[model samples]
Target: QDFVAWLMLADAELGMGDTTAGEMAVQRGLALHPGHPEAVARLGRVRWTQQRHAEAAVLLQQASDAAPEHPGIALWLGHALEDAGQAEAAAAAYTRAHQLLPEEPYITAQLLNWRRRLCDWRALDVLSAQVRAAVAQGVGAVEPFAFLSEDASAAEQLACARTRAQAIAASVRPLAPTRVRSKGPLRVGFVSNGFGAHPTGLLTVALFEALQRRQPDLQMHLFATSGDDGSTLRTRLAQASTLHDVTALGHLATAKHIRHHGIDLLFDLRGWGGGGRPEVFALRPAPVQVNWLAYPGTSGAPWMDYVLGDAFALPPALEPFYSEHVLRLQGAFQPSDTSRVVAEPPSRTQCGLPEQGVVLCCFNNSYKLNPQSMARMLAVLREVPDSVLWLLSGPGEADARLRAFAHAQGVDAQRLVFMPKLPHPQYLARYRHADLFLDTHPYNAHTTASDALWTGCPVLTTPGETFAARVAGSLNHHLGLDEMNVADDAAFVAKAVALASDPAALTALHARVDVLRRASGVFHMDGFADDFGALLQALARRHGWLGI
Candidate 1:
């Protein structure tokens, strides 16, 4: 009974985000019953939360060995293995978990997500159907972020996110309300783990700098949840905003710190995505929390009052699906580093490209290169004479699978060129050689789209119902390149074939992209700052936090 009590205490502490206390409680249980699988698994979860993935895997594996029927332990082992970079091992674990609990949607979702990441599409339709059915019935908690990759409707997405948010709300306790400060200069706070050299940092570094320069009176505070990478981007972010390294603080402490800072408006930069502490927002640390950037979908959580997006991305049709009040930005919702300079690219031969034909590229992550997306691109390749498709090399055997898929489809496997991921400058430079960027559906190119457009490569995309599908289209819409946003897959292929067939047309399109990259509001950070600041002030006034 005492051992059970200790395990319960550990779970409660861990649920509350007190990992240290949770681990101590698990240790006490282990002392009473040495080598107990339950106690061992609890300690393993603590390590997992701490991001010591390998250590977590060992303990979780031990627990699974002792209790082979424990589906939850096996599921968690899958997560630890995946994070530890043991992709195949992770798949086996997830498969085992699903087999143990075949009807559980969460387990099914994990297995499906892993298979998609690995490009392992066997039984993909079956798995997707099961998860979608479960979501439709509101049976179990499916991860909202992963659900975005599915062809689910917007209402379905809202249901998935709302269910997930309800689960999160049930687990954590909210902090007591604090006094509202109604007379300040609109102090804003942003919470994210990507304040270093990650995509979030790269995308927003210039925008933050521009906001500071344009609104000298506005105070920006970045509550960084990740450790410093000591990169130039991190340094620049630190210089632009009051950077608070809250990596060491627990969820409760981090929320307390934000509350103590007296921030009038807080932006949850990382929402529901990986490394985001939704628990912080669960605690109600800030009076007003907005969801923006990072996560492209709607935040179905009750704590999120608004979602900052552009009209192109967040149309009236999508408003019913979003839980937060949708707020419009004047331009594209995503901001690029306008200061980023695209360096000169290497020769076509050096980059593994044939010197003559048009180079069609899609640098979106390998996971976004689903079977349907691949099929569309291969159709374009078959029609466009001597054209090759360039892709960012995916993790594990994704490239090989794509090559094999291409060969089976009667297209030469050699035409599918893989470019290993490079540093930001080098990656941006490569766009100079790309004639057109082919976007993926369900999850379109986001930062990669920005990179392609910023470097004069025009993107052709099919906008779908969800936010994730329309980002590239929004960028195209905001850049005044509506022709690039094709109506359907047939149009996408026709456009690519037309561009490849007519060199002059493609060249003219490229020139237009270059000319508008400077002229459009899409890349102009000052104008973006003006809209963003006005939005914040309007939100502040709406809540009576700032004087009209």
Candidate 2:
């Protein structure tokens, strides 16, 4: 009874992620039965949850070895290895868990997710097909965000997302009716776990300042799920709205609090990514709900009423594939602060570039690149004499793989320059160094496109068939740089070659972009605020509000 009681308590504590108490309870249980598999596994979970990934891998590995078929032990070991960055080994552990618990969606999904991260392409087609089939049948067999990188089309993306929405709704649908309704001012709430040094912060913080400038007629609210990391961006967002510190609140509780506040519109800034709280959206606490920034895909969820986008980003004809009503706006669906600073361009030596020729640049995250994009960029470099490609540095291995890829393409590896991350202001400053920005495909540089455009840098992009692939084209269209938006791989490569070869044309293009940036409707924050207010009121009007 004593062993059972302490073991039960340890399991409870571990489940709640309270590693301090969980470790004590687990130790007490292990004291009763030395190295009991269940107790050891619980302790292993506690260690990993506490960020002791290395120690946890050792402990959980031994526990999993002893109970070879135990899915829980194997699952914990997988997470431990994953956190420790042993991606190859983590896949094996996740595979073992999937074999042991074949029906566990999370375990199966973990196997697929980690494999993709490791770039392990073996049997990938077969594996993804199975997961894709499962998703289309509405099984909720895999996660939607992870599915994005698979480069699936709109219909396929919708299948996975719709299945995901169905999976989450079952948990909270019963409680949805209890939502507290608020009245007055058509309250607008933005929910995100990111308001710090992430892409979301880079893209959004200044817009909050723009919203603040208008003395917002609507009551602006923020439901932040993440704790403040003390970034300047977080400080700025704190000043923008009635900040709801729901970092300590559970998902359901957070939803209830938003409901209690009488939020008229809830905009989910994160659709499906780490630290996302889709459960709150599933609870349906607001009169109008939207999926907006950060995630560049459909929510596919039935509960979400709208996805904020522009006519270019979400063409009207493609609406059927999405579960939400595509609320098309005028400019690029994504907004930029437009007030970003571009410091004096550094000397070629300081930027590690040659003082001589055309500099081709790509600052998008490394994962967005595949063989085709790299190959295309390499071809451009081969055509442009003395030109260099400046890539945003990623993992140590990412730089190695890319350099190796460039070398294999017979281009000088020295032409590939990797730039370490810099502060946002300094990062933007480097755009002046590059003559042209080459974008990645199937996943175009979303924030990075705006980052480049805001710096008056001309971005040449090839739009693909997917929504993600179309983003850069949309932004370029709004900036009226349609000449830089190419159609296919051949056209993209030819365009890059022609543009790089024509120094006069490239210089003129960039000069035009710089001049148009301040005057362009896309970059005007005041007009954006007006349009945003109009959208909200129109959405509010649909729900019987007289505000519009």
Candidate 3:
């Protein structure tokens, strides 16, 4: 009972974003009843808050198993599974939780969010129907602030969104410039919360590596907010760039630091996710402020000067969706990491995957797996006999939820494999184990696609009307592999199956990818750095810097 009470308190604290207080309460609860289901669940949640996904998954699964009837435990376990990179299992866990406690707003929202990420547009219709039905029944319905629009293909949607965002950007009050004239070396500051072992960090690492090799006249500054322990990639990042651990430092201090450094351009890599410090850009410490590679959508901030994008990702029609002027690149803006070499081939047994069946992997975050996408994936699996779906994410009860969802869609429980969260380098290396990368839609894989390519895995992407849908398409186009970009969901699944089944074609594709990696500007940091330098120089020149 004490454990349960503490768990309740922890939940309250977590909602208030007092993660430290919540963790302490969880710890105390665990001390009293180590194996208590409620306490274990609370501790698991705390572990997740701390980004200790692997440990959180173990505890969450235990809690869910211990309290099979408890919807709360099941929900948490579902989240853990998603974080562990197990999308199908996470969906199953969520589905079971929903069954236990139907019409719970939080669970419903989570399920919808996951389904959307998985590119299941049909699930959106179902969710919309549910929302309408609930409203008709006088049951209060929840609407996600982000999911305000149901119409996927509203004409020139990107343009209108960009315009609104750019208007917001223009309204922000700019700060007084700290540096008056041209200095010896131009300082460029890049700020992001995704500088850990995640896809964002991996991409940043590659960009920094390239910048280090190519740009001698410019200094790179990285402001990272989160990370995991024993991360070789983090160590390499620390070595590669001038990193500022800004997790503790709020927006104002970050702005002050940029000013102190006399930065020429302050780049925000985190567009709108958790830990985004747009307020720093709002402060406008540097002479120029830019948003790039973080979010594909509009920031709606007025202080930002430019948003880096490509021809395919942010077309002329999409400019109105952003608040800043589009700084269009020739191709995709992903930086290729030279340090990440594809290691040994991973067998199914090595990664706890089944040895016999063909595995289809979606290593995207669990939040991206929606009911529609889940159903579609299951449909694909049903069509292809002996084909299993492997989802790599943080471990949790979400695994069971996803399994249940798959079962509901007539897919066998044994067909899904949930992997525990891994360190970034190991995760990248593990990409070799998959036959092909199945790209997410609506909210597409930004850095995940780049990571997969670096690991020699080819992705099958379907373009969406929204900014999220175009990410993989943009990258594929930039890499000169336009054939991989599918126009619709049917084509996406068909292409993936064909690539997986044809060994000769797959081998040729892999060889072509190797050649592309070497020849394409996507991986060439020196070339990217040179281009980046020119961009910065051009910007500086526009700002009346005669030295450039």
Candidate 4:
């Protein structure tokens, strides 16, 4: 009677989303029976919900030890350990869960993804084989986010996205009946957690203001699924028609609110990346949904109706890999704020650069710069003597690791000048100091490239097959600077070296960028806004929601 009552109270409290009450009830029950593994496990879940991951790990460890073969306990224990920032331990826990429940594809996926995130892809070939086998056998185990790191084919990406949508649809129900667009201005809604202090915010906030100002008839709204940091961008975003603070609401409630608002077209700015809520999108509150910005790859999920791209980034010839229909927007899919004010840059001496030497910058995140790309950068450095590689500083010993990698490539580690992260305006200012921007492949700089071009710093990119690899090429193509887009690594290094060596050619490129920055196309968000508004108008007309 005590065990049943305790279990009832514990579940009732937790289900109501009150971890405090759930934990209290859980302890009261466990006090009667100290070795009750189920109640102990329940308490661990409550602690996990409370963000007390360390406490949750201990409780889950105890419960799992008591019930060694309980796969559920192991699964939650894996989650607890992962949340506690113990990736290797969490992977072990996930592996243990998979061992206990051999057919649990989600557990296998978790283990695979966690290992991949840590870049500890031990036996990844074997693991990927297992992933494929599991998927074919009906578990359809992997998620789109995890599968992206595997560099799967487009068909595999579509399968992963559809598989995830099927899994999510099994559990989640739409908050309202299927609705059609009403005959009125397009009720465009945007979802993003980065209303401020984030790349999404910095990139799109200005665009939002532009759309609203220029296209008044097209109604707009923003749904921020996370709390704001009281940032200026947040203030800017609040200027939208309805900036809903649905962060505190549960998924069901959030979906219900959006459905109630009758959103005609929804733009998912975050997609599967940071500050994204894919489950909420799974509810299908809007008539049409789009995947844009943040995540630079196919969502491979059915919930997203369209994947926004352009000729350079997502070519029509490469559309087969995506689960969603492709919507090729005019100009680059990337948006920029031409009004951005760049601060004055620190001198070469201040930035520890040799005043006489060539200065080349690649401010992409350190993780994006693998050994292969690093080797190419060094080759260019060798070709252009005394050139400096301005790099973005990353956490831990990443700085040390990269400098050592440069040393191994026969490039002087001293020439790799690691730049500390700065505020947006300050960061933009530093771009002027560098003569040329070198792009990273397989995950080219998106917003970083925009920052360079808008600030009159010329960028050189080598386009590759993947969507991520081709983004910088797209931007350069839109700007009518196709010469900066090379075909392969050899071409990329040779061109970069040649440009760096020829002072006049480099000067002319920068001069073109300065004129283009003011003239039109990519840097000018105003013209793109007009084109996008017209696109929205046609879509609204097709959907019977005339944005006329």
Candidate 5:
């Protein structure tokens, strides 16, 4: 009974995002019952939370050895192994967990998500079908973020997010009502784990800085959930806002702290994405909360009163799918780090490109490069003679798998070129070598689309029904480059072939992108800040808050 009590306490602490307290709880449990699989598994989870991946694998492996029948242990072990750089072993562990708990949709989701990352297409159709069926039946609280990667519809994605949000809501108690400060500057808190040199920071740093300069009445308070990575972006974000390093605080503590600031509006910058604390939002940190960038879909969260998106990404037809009132921005919803200008390009030989061939690149992560997108890209490659497909290298054997897929599609495997992942600045420079960017459907390029367009590379995309599928199209639409937004796969391939065959047309397209980069409101941060501020003010007014 005492051991079970300690284990339960550890679970409660861990669930609250207090890994240290969880570790102590597990330690106390271990002291009472040495070699207890549950206590050992709990400690393993704590190590995973602390990002000691190898140590996490060790403890989880020990627990698995003792309790091999525990599918939960196998699932946790799979996560640790994956983070520890043991990709194949992680896949095996996931498979084992799935075999043990075939009915558990969460396990199935994890397996599908990881396999996609590894570019392991084996049983992908089967797994996706199972997950889709389960979601259709409202069977499990499968992860919504991973669901976005699947070719699911907007309504299905909404259902997935709602299920997960309901699960989170059921676990936590909302905070008591706090006194509202309606007199002074509006304290708008942006909560995210990516306030450092992460994607969220990369996209929003310039806008936050602009908001500071333009909207002096609106004070930006950032609850940075991640630790300081000490990057220049983090420094700039700090300089622009009242940055709070809430890294060590648990979810409840973090929410209470934000509430104590008397914030008029709180933006969930990381909604249902990795490292996001949805638990904090579940506890109701601020009176008005919003779902915005970082996660490219409806939050389906009751705590989120609004979802901030542009019309292209969130169309009028898709409005019925969202739980929150869709607040459409006048311009493209995504913001870029517009301050970073493109540097001089290196030689094609240096970047592993043929000295003369046209470079077609898709820098979207491997998971987005599903078989359908890959086949479409290959079709483009097959028709365009003297063109090579440049891809961002995927984790583990993804590159090899992609190469194999290309060979199977009757395209020369040599036509596919893989580039190693680089730092943001370095990666930005690589876009200079490419002639055109091909986008992935279902999970279209978000930040990558902005990066490509900013670097004078035109993005060709076919928008789908969901927000994740339409982000790149939104960027193109806002830039007035609607020609690049093709209607279907045949049109996409035909456009690529035409561009590759005509050097003049491709060069003119690049020139157009260069001109639009300077003129387009999509890349204009100051204008974005104005629109964002107005939307927040409108939301504040709607909620009966004064003087925002």
Candidate 6:
């Protein structure tokens, strides 16, 4: 009877995209019979769909335990564990899964993703070779070659991309006119998709707030995307600036609107990241389109006049990499507005973590994980036996694949725990559960690292060839933790392990971060705003804007 009812509920919910209900139905069916492998596995699938990673891990593990011959359970269990933040444990699970299902795309993509995130050049080279071989054998199309041609090589594509971007930046430098006198309050416009509760919004709020207190010398205008209307952050931003909810505005329309406003200096907060509209810049909406915090790399857009950076983030040596004339800030580039305090940490049990183990967290999106990173992390775990790896789970099949990869890497699956996605405050609190933060490479953690630092977890990162890769190092450099930015892979792993093993060192680092947070100009909105204002003024003067 329970089985029939459960089946009905699962079908109905699955059709409606209500994965949580489907998971509950499967759980109810399993409750009626112990050691039901199929039922358990089904529950795992449902739990995965529902984003209940920890629960999925337990159920999938049970299925694998019940029927070791069934590789599906092993694979499922591996992913569940990976999503649950048990990196070592997930690796172990993946090892078993890989042994059972060697050539599965789900398994392979997972492993490759982890390796790529770790910046494992060797693994990447090997993978590229394999793809080439496959294509040569006529087993695949030229798609592999296309990928290799674009970005798979040893930072070659990234370098080329940067060069192209820099060339575009150079073209705009000549257009920068000198600043005109203050012609009845200079009209300043800010364009961004992350103008709500996102980290971009958080960093920018302080700047806008500071501008609000200005002596009517600036009329701030914000072009924002959709977000919660009641957001306190949004409310503050609205109060601070003249808000233009451009959520429904298309790129061409947005550009027209900016041009209509006769904006003197149009600031583009979005570069090349998600939701960035480079087309608007391409259309030449404003006389001065300055690229700020959105994408770390160059936009390769001709209309973007300047790319804003600080000494630590985009040093003089890195100027050639940008697409725009670099506007170097004397202090930190990104600022954190901590006007609202994040939530308190949950109890160890609540976080599904062992109370005593040293928690090493990597809170970036799962796409950042690659095989080399997983291997390096496993090496750290091997040296520090009591250390645990924490991660946030991605959606659906991604969870299973991540776990399977970790399991293959020889780490215990139980030690891994996945964090469910939460709101900003709760998410910030989750950082407290971690003892130290491990930054991903090639594509580094930007906002995630900032959140970790705010939670007092010191991030250890390696500087890479591109702007995206150097974000962690840049942030650490700004915070005065020069040692935290290692140059090579071995150093990165070694530093992380050393810090994890030394309690006193870790504690001191933690305390020092708190002191640095206050003392450093990184989070000071007033100082950043003033610096930014000056830079804008300089650009205006250079551009020869004859009015105010």
| lDDT by residue for model 3 (1-548), tens | 56568777888899766798888787888778777888888788888878888898899898888899999889889888888888768878887887887667557656665665554444567675564444334332333223323334423333333434444456556567554247467778888776665556767676677678778777888877765434666777788788888777766777787788787878888766557756677777887888787766665556677888788888777767666788876557767567666666466687877776667778777656655456667767887787888886433445676787788789898888887776566677777777677877666767778878877778778867666678888888988999998878788778877776666897788788878977888777777777877887777778766663
By summed lDDT, the worst window of 10 consecutive residues in model 3 runs over: 140-149
lDDT at 384, model 1: 87
Per-candidate local distance difference test:
0.88, 0.80, 0.72, 0.79, 0.88, 0.70
lDDT of 1 at 505: 94
Higher-lDDT candidate among 3 and 4?
Answer: 4
Q: Please, what are the lDDT tens digits per residue for candidate 4 over residues 1-548?
A: 56678777878788678776777787887788776788788888887888789999999999989998998899999999888977667878888887887666777777776665543445667776777666655567676555655545556566666776677777777655464466666788888887777778888877777888898878888898878778778888887457888888887888888888888888888766655777888888887888887777777666777888898788987888777788878888888766678878889889777789889988987546655567888889998887889988765456776777688788889998888988777788888789999888666888899898888898899887778778889988888888999888899899999999999988998999888778757766777778787787776676665334
Clashing pairs in 5: none
Alpha carbon lDDT at 63, candidate 6: 79
The regions of model 1 sitting more than 4 angstroms off are 1-52, 55-73, 178-180, 545-548
Structure candidate 4, residue pairs in collision: 154-321, 161-300, 161-301
* RMSD after CA superposition, every candidate: 2.8, 3.2, 7.5, 4.1, 2.7, 11.5
Model 4 spans > 4 angstroms off: 1-18, 25-45, 53-143, 178-182, 349-354, 546-548
lDDT of 5 by residue, 264-339 (tens): 7889998788879999998887888888888888887888888888889888989999999888899998998989
Q: How many residue pairs clash in each candidate?
A: 0, 1, 62, 3, 0, 52
lDDT of 6 at 354: 94
Q: How accurate is candidate 1 locally (lDDT)?
A: 0.88
> Which residue window of length 10 is worst by lDDT in model 1?
177-186
Residue 427 lDDT, candidate 4, scale 0-100: 82
lDDT of 2 by residue, 11-88 (tens): 777767566787788888888899977888777778777877888888888888899988888888888988887766
Candidates by lDDT, descending order? 5, 1, 2, 4, 3, 6
Give the TM-scores of the predictions, in the order they appear.
0.92, 0.90, 0.72, 0.84, 0.93, 0.70
Position 26, candidate 5: lDDT: 81
